[PDB]
């Protein structure tokens, strides 16, 4: 269970859907990610791009991180703003990609992926605590704590 | 010690300050980041936001790295360029907050998150070695090496 | 092995190139990455900066993931896009750097860090499986599977 994971399909069997997270080979980091539906983003655009599929189970000690793919960022001027995915999100998984290009549109196809996804190590903080330090004497001050 | 963190809250308490970080659901690999005091960032600006709070303690094996908040990013066309947190730094956490509209301010309030910090497990490299291989031969020479 | 990274310098020795990746501080998590050659970054513009190196060997369990820099964002209204080293890429390192100012390029110079590398922990995949879940019953159908 410590190097697996569980894809959740949102569409029901034998409804047309995203092709699903395909390993990306060569390599071992990364999830190619793909669009449910075809768009041309337009110059200076944002977009929130549907990819079929939740994470049912995540990695042990890990969460999903949906990162850029270097040629698209490079070829098609684009960027992937935000995409932190937590251990208890359930949802459809959905790509923010921004279009840079003051001129040309972003072609968003259903067999090319617009995304990766990594599965990277994290601490999830046991014991917390804040504290106010006094700037001239070094005296420590607890304001609150607290344990998951 | 392995799963704890130690926030140093830098206004004495009574102080009027930022809200602290804090993680929204059990699930959340995140602690929320909150602005000190209120702003409005100008389109295609570019703005350093001071939190109220420092890092005293990291858990074991982590540094700190803030990233975007979904929400933040999409309805407000923002990003969050630069978020690296050394083990070693002592000062605030600032976020640099990119707005990239061309026509709307992005309003930062103080009981709204502005972005999420992530202790994620990173290695700290105890040797290190640069070598260029001979063409001919494919013979390794070592150019430097050095301990940590 | 667990802890430790070897760098390919890519130019011969004796022939002038980058300065190597480096830490700065004993509490640094991240290599500086400096460029071969010196370029000015017009505005809007994206660049592909040569860093003179490639990871010949990662540590155990990790990946090289390219970051910005924060001096460099703030001071020069720049940003990094991709920086996904896979474990299996021996090439050279080339830092995608984006210049947002409409106004002002960017100086890229030869002494100067123009981004930072870090060596995170990620899960290398050995199973995975794509699952239908009915919403009525918790009934799990297995689509597909792989190795």
Redesign the interface.
């Known amino acids: 269970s410590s190097?697996?994971?569980?894809?959740?399909?949102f569409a029901?069997?034998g409804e047309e859907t995203a092709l699903?997270?395909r390993?990306?080979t060569?390599?071992?980091?990364?999830?190619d990610l793909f669009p449910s539906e075809e768009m041309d983003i337009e110059p200076?655009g944002?977009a929130?791009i549907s990819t079929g599929?939740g994470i049912?189970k995540f990695?042990?000690?890990?969460?999903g991180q949906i990162?850029?793919?270097?040629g698209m960022?490079?070829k098609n001027?684009?960027?992937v703003?935000?995409?932190?995915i937590?251990?208890?999100?359930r949802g459809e998984l959905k790509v923010?990609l921004?279009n840079?290009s003051?001129e040309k549109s972003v072609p968003i196809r259903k067999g090319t992926s617009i995304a990766?996804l990594?599965?990277?190590?994290?601490?999830?903080?046991?014991?917390?605590?804040?504290?106010?330090?006094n700037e001239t004497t070094g005296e420590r001050?607890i304001?609150?704590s607290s344990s998951?």
Chains 1, 2 share one sequence.
């Open positions: 190097a697996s994971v569980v894809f959740m399909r029901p069997p699903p997270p390993r990306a060569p390599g071992s980091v990364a999830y200076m944002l929130k599929y049912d990695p042990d000690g890990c969460y990162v850029s793919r270097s960022t490079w001027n684009t960027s703003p935000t995409g932190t937590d251990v208890d999100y923010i921004r840079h003051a990766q990594i599965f990277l190590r994290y601490c999830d903080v046991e014991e917390e605590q804040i504290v106010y330090i001050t304001i609150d998951k």
